[PDB]
Amino acid sequence: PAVTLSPNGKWLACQSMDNQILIFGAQNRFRLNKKKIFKGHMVAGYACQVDFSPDMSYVISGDGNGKLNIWDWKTTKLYSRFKAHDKVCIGAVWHPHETSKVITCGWDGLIKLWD
Amino acid sequence: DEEELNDYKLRKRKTFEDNIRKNRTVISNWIKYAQWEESLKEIQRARSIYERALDVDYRNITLWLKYAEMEMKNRQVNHARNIWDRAITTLPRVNQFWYKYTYMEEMLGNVAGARQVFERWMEWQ
Amino acid sequence: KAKRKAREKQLEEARRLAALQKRRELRAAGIEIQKK
């Protein structure tokens, strides 16, 4: 559903509707990095907008289950899983110039900032 | 408990409804429907259930019995007394009705009421 | 007759199961579609 370029411009991180996010090298030969495969979402049927913080250390991800997941994009694992929205949590956008800011839109009609 | 449980309820309810739809005579299905309800603790449901069953067969001692047994186990004691007097009004020559009425009245303490219901009772010698 | 109907006494439940497990995971995924 969704593809976001890492603010380093090295990776296209595309939320694959197989419930997980896949990273590819966007600068090198269409390589799928299976060492960068973010696990634990449910994206089949939803377009979860996932993003990257500016330090390339953190990734933010949405699930339709109300789950805001805050992952350490290096360790490939999430460090937080909380209530983002009630309806389909569509946009989970990391702010590039703010450290804590994760702004979420969704089918819920309420537009949140989290910090 | 959102919808797996709720749909299990929906199923069992639809079943009991179809079984009593087929027969609506012999009562075991009426009872089992109702006691399933009471075990799920919806006594408004179970109440309407026993009224309908009592409609189709108001000469069933076991129906009257377990109706009032529900009411007593849930101590809507006023409701229970209404049940018991209606019973002993329509099926007087049944004795266990009179009995359970008194016994429950006794552990309720209203022995003035117990006396007068025994006066009632003896009017039938 | 008798024993056949015993066989679908379960394999029916798998259907609501495979309806449940899909749809709970389905609708929680971000899509609240109703069958009709």
Coordinates of C-alpha atoms in Angstrom, one line a residue:
Chain A
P1 CA 0.0 0.0 0.0
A2 CA 2.5 2.6 1.1
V3 CA 6.2 3.4 0.4
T4 CA 8.3 6.0 2.2
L5 CA 11.9 6.9 1.5
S6 CA 14.2 6.9 4.5
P7 CA 15.3 10.5 5.2
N8 CA 18.8 9.2 4.3
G9 CA 17.5 8.5 0.8
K10 CA 19.1 5.0 0.9
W11 CA 16.0 2.9 1.5
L12 CA 12.4 2.6 0.2
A13 CA 10.5 1.2 3.2
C14 CA 7.2 -0.1 1.8
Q15 CA 4.5 -1.4 4.1
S16 CA 3.6 -4.7 2.3
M17 CA 0.1 -5.8 2.8
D18 CA 1.5 -9.1 4.0
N19 CA 1.1 -7.4 7.4
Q20 CA 4.8 -6.5 7.5
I21 CA 7.1 -3.7 6.2
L22 CA 9.9 -4.4 3.7
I23 CA 13.0 -2.3 3.2
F24 CA 14.7 -2.1 -0.2
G25 CA 17.8 -0.3 -1.3
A26 CA 16.4 2.5 -3.4
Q27 CA 19.9 3.6 -4.6
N28 CA 21.2 0.1 -5.4
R29 CA 19.8 -2.5 -7.9
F30 CA 16.3 -3.1 -6.4
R31 CA 17.7 -5.2 -3.5
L32 CA 15.3 -6.5 -0.9
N33 CA 17.0 -6.4 2.5
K34 CA 15.5 -9.3 4.5
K35 CA 17.6 -8.2 7.4
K36 CA 15.3 -5.2 7.3
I37 CA 11.8 -6.8 7.5
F38 CA 9.6 -5.1 10.1
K39 CA 7.2 -7.6 11.7
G40 CA 4.0 -7.6 13.7
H41 CA 1.4 -5.4 11.9
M42 CA -1.8 -6.3 10.2
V43 CA -1.9 -4.4 6.9
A44 CA -3.9 -6.8 4.7
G45 CA -6.7 -4.5 3.6
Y46 CA -5.3 -1.4 5.2
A47 CA -2.8 1.2 3.9
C48 CA -0.9 1.8 7.0
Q49 CA 1.3 4.9 6.5
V50 CA 4.6 4.1 8.2
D51 CA 7.5 6.6 8.5
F52 CA 11.1 7.1 9.6
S53 CA 12.5 9.5 12.2
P54 CA 15.4 11.7 11.1
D55 CA 18.2 9.8 12.9
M56 CA 17.3 6.6 10.9
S57 CA 17.2 4.9 14.3
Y58 CA 13.4 4.8 14.8
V59 CA 10.5 3.8 12.6
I60 CA 6.9 4.4 13.3
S61 CA 4.2 2.1 12.0
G62 CA 0.4 1.9 12.2
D63 CA -2.0 -1.0 12.5
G64 CA -5.8 -1.1 12.0
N65 CA -6.0 -2.7 15.5
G66 CA -5.5 0.7 17.2
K67 CA -1.7 -0.1 17.4
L68 CA 0.8 2.7 17.1
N69 CA 4.1 0.7 17.0
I70 CA 7.4 2.5 17.6
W71 CA 10.2 0.3 16.4
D72 CA 14.0 0.5 16.5
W73 CA 14.4 0.2 12.8
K74 CA 17.9 -1.2 13.3
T75 CA 17.1 -4.0 15.7
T76 CA 14.1 -4.8 13.4
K77 CA 11.9 -5.0 16.5
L78 CA 9.3 -2.7 18.1
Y79 CA 10.0 -1.0 21.5
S80 CA 6.4 0.3 21.9
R81 CA 2.9 -0.9 20.9
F82 CA 0.0 1.4 22.1
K83 CA -3.4 2.7 21.2
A84 CA -3.1 5.1 18.2
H85 CA -6.7 5.3 16.9
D86 CA -10.0 3.5 17.3
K87 CA -10.6 3.1 13.5
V88 CA -8.0 2.2 10.9
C89 CA -4.8 4.0 12.0
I90 CA -3.8 5.3 8.5
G91 CA -1.1 7.9 8.8
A92 CA 1.6 7.4 11.3
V93 CA 4.1 10.1 10.3
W94 CA 7.4 10.8 12.2
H95 CA 8.3 14.4 12.3
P96 CA 11.8 15.0 10.7
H97 CA 12.5 18.2 12.7
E98 CA 10.8 17.1 16.0
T99 CA 12.3 14.3 18.2
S100 CA 9.2 12.8 19.8
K101 CA 6.5 13.9 17.4
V102 CA 4.4 11.1 15.8
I103 CA 1.4 12.6 14.1
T104 CA -1.5 10.2 13.3
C105 CA -4.5 10.4 11.0
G106 CA -6.9 7.6 10.4
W107 CA -10.4 6.5 9.6
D108 CA -11.1 7.7 13.2
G109 CA -11.7 11.3 12.4
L110 CA -9.5 12.5 15.2
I111 CA -6.0 13.8 14.4
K112 CA -3.4 13.2 17.0
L113 CA 0.1 14.3 17.9
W114 CA 2.0 12.1 20.3
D115 CA 5.2 13.1 22.2
Chain B
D1 CA -16.0 -11.1 24.9
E2 CA -16.9 -8.8 22.0
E3 CA -18.1 -11.1 19.2
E4 CA -16.8 -14.7 19.5
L5 CA -18.8 -15.1 22.7
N6 CA -21.7 -13.0 21.3
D7 CA -22.0 -15.2 18.2
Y8 CA -21.8 -18.4 20.3
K9 CA -24.8 -16.9 22.1
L10 CA -26.5 -16.1 18.7
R11 CA -26.0 -19.7 17.6
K12 CA -27.3 -21.4 20.8
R13 CA -30.2 -19.0 20.9
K14 CA -31.2 -19.7 17.3
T15 CA -31.0 -23.4 17.9
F16 CA -33.3 -23.4 20.9
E17 CA -35.6 -21.2 19.0
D18 CA -35.8 -23.7 16.1
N19 CA -36.3 -26.7 18.4
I20 CA -39.2 -25.0 20.2
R21 CA -40.4 -23.9 16.8
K22 CA -40.6 -27.5 15.6
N23 CA -42.3 -28.9 18.7
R24 CA -43.4 -26.1 21.1
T25 CA -45.0 -29.0 22.8
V26 CA -42.8 -31.2 25.1
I27 CA -41.1 -28.8 27.4
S28 CA -37.5 -30.0 27.9
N29 CA -36.5 -27.6 25.1
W30 CA -38.3 -24.7 26.8
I31 CA -36.5 -25.5 30.1
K32 CA -33.1 -26.0 28.6
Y33 CA -33.4 -22.7 26.7
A34 CA -34.4 -20.9 29.8
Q35 CA -31.8 -22.4 32.2
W36 CA -29.1 -21.7 29.6
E37 CA -30.4 -18.1 29.7
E38 CA -30.3 -18.0 33.6
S39 CA -26.8 -19.4 33.5
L40 CA -25.9 -16.5 31.1
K41 CA -27.7 -14.3 33.7
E42 CA -30.4 -12.5 31.6
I43 CA -33.4 -13.0 33.8
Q44 CA -35.6 -10.7 31.7
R45 CA -35.1 -13.1 28.8
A46 CA -35.6 -16.1 31.0
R47 CA -38.7 -14.5 32.4
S48 CA -40.4 -14.0 29.1
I49 CA -39.4 -17.5 28.2
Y50 CA -41.2 -19.1 31.2
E51 CA -44.3 -17.0 30.5
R52 CA -44.5 -18.2 26.9
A53 CA -43.9 -21.8 28.0
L54 CA -46.5 -21.4 30.6
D55 CA -48.9 -20.2 28.0
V56 CA -48.5 -23.2 25.8
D57 CA -48.9 -25.5 28.8
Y58 CA -50.2 -24.0 32.0
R59 CA -50.7 -27.4 33.6
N60 CA -47.1 -28.3 34.0
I61 CA -46.0 -28.6 37.6
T62 CA -42.3 -28.8 36.7
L63 CA -42.7 -25.6 34.6
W64 CA -44.3 -23.7 37.5
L65 CA -41.6 -25.2 39.8
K66 CA -38.5 -24.2 38.0
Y67 CA -39.9 -20.8 37.1
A68 CA -40.3 -20.0 40.7
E69 CA -36.9 -21.7 41.5
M70 CA -35.2 -19.2 39.2
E71 CA -37.1 -16.4 41.0
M72 CA -36.0 -17.6 44.4
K73 CA -32.4 -18.3 43.5
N74 CA -32.3 -14.7 42.3
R75 CA -34.4 -13.4 45.3
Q76 CA -36.8 -11.1 43.4
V77 CA -38.8 -12.3 46.4
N78 CA -41.8 -10.1 45.5
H79 CA -41.8 -11.6 42.0
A80 CA -41.5 -15.1 43.5
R81 CA -44.5 -14.6 45.7
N82 CA -46.6 -13.4 42.8
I83 CA -45.5 -16.5 40.9
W84 CA -46.5 -18.8 43.9
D85 CA -49.9 -17.2 44.4
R86 CA -50.7 -17.4 40.7
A87 CA -49.7 -21.1 40.8
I88 CA -51.7 -22.0 43.8
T89 CA -54.6 -20.1 42.2
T90 CA -54.7 -22.0 39.0
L91 CA -53.6 -25.5 40.2
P92 CA -54.8 -25.5 43.8
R93 CA -55.0 -29.3 44.2
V94 CA -51.3 -29.6 43.7
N95 CA -49.7 -29.7 47.1
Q96 CA -46.0 -29.1 46.6
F97 CA -46.9 -25.6 45.4
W98 CA -48.4 -24.8 48.7
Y99 CA -45.4 -26.4 50.4
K100 CA -42.6 -24.5 48.7
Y101 CA -44.7 -21.4 49.1
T102 CA -44.7 -21.8 52.9
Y103 CA -41.1 -23.0 53.3
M104 CA -39.8 -20.0 51.4
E105 CA -42.2 -17.7 53.4
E106 CA -40.8 -19.2 56.6
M107 CA -37.1 -18.6 55.8
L108 CA -38.4 -15.2 54.9
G109 CA -39.9 -14.8 58.4
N110 CA -43.3 -13.4 57.3
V111 CA -45.0 -16.0 59.4
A112 CA -48.2 -13.9 59.5
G113 CA -48.3 -14.4 55.7
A114 CA -47.5 -18.1 56.3
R115 CA -50.5 -18.4 58.6
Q116 CA -52.9 -16.7 56.2
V117 CA -51.7 -18.9 53.3
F118 CA -52.3 -21.9 55.4
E119 CA -55.8 -20.5 56.0
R120 CA -56.2 -20.3 52.3
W121 CA -54.9 -23.8 51.9
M122 CA -57.2 -25.3 54.4
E123 CA -60.2 -23.7 52.7
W124 CA -59.7 -26.6 50.4
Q125 CA -59.5 -29.1 53.4
Chain C
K1 CA -28.4 -40.0 8.5
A2 CA -27.4 -40.0 12.2
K3 CA -23.7 -40.4 12.0
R4 CA -23.1 -38.2 9.0
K5 CA -24.9 -35.3 10.8
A6 CA -22.4 -36.0 13.6
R7 CA -19.5 -35.3 11.1
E8 CA -20.7 -31.8 10.2
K9 CA -21.5 -31.1 13.8
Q10 CA -17.8 -30.1 14.0
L11 CA -16.8 -29.2 10.4
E12 CA -19.5 -26.6 10.6
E13 CA -17.8 -25.1 13.6
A14 CA -14.5 -24.9 11.6
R15 CA -16.4 -22.7 9.1
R16 CA -17.4 -20.1 11.7
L17 CA -13.9 -20.6 13.0
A18 CA -12.3 -19.9 9.6
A19 CA -14.9 -17.1 9.3
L20 CA -13.9 -15.9 12.8
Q21 CA -10.2 -16.2 12.5
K22 CA -10.1 -14.5 9.1
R23 CA -12.6 -11.8 10.0
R24 CA -11.3 -10.9 13.5
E25 CA -7.9 -10.6 11.9
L26 CA -9.5 -9.1 8.8
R27 CA -11.6 -6.4 10.4
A28 CA -8.9 -5.6 13.0
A29 CA -6.5 -5.2 10.1
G30 CA -8.2 -1.9 9.2
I31 CA -11.2 -2.9 7.2
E32 CA -14.7 -3.2 8.7
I33 CA -16.4 -4.9 5.8
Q34 CA -19.7 -6.8 6.5
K35 CA -20.6 -9.9 4.5
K36 CA -24.0 -8.5 3.8

